[PDB]
């Protein structure tokens, strides 16, 4: 009714291509630690 899965999946799909989490909370802390740590340290 509100949101079952497809409208959450169809989005979840499209971010993985765009390799991006926090728009739809897609990727994991695991992978985002890598980026955030690689960014924060290099930046």
């Amino acid at each position: 009714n509100g949101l079952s899965e497809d409208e959450a999946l169809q989005r979840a799909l499209e971010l993985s291509l765009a390799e991006a989490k926090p728009q739809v909370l897609s990727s994991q802390e695991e992978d985002d630690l890598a980026l955030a740590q690689a960014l924060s340290a290099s930046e």
């Binding site: 926090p22 802390e29 985002d32 630690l33 980026l35 955030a36 960014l39 924060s40 340290a41």
Partner: protein, 72 residues
């Protein structure tokens, strides 16, 4: 004035004092993006930010980018 970057690159900006804890920053991030306090992680210089500490305890001063990483 400190930025809060994300993996998408949604650079949301915050205005908090050096004396303000990271607890406040979690609550201020809540105000901006609806995200519980215990499910956020803020990185700076490849170093984890604790709750009890303030921006003065670490070397965070001004125009400082703060990389956010959520957990499920």
């Amino acid at each position: 004035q400190i930025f809060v970057k994300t993996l998408t690159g949604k650079t949301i900006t915050l205005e908090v004092e050096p004396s303000d804890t990271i607890e406040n920053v979690k609550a201020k991030i809540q105000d901006k993006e609806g995200i519980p306090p215990d499910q956020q992680r803020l990185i700076f210089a490849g170093k984890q930010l604790e709750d009890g500490r303030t921006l003065s305890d670490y070397n965070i001063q001004k125009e400082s980018t703060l990389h956010l990483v959520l957990r499920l």
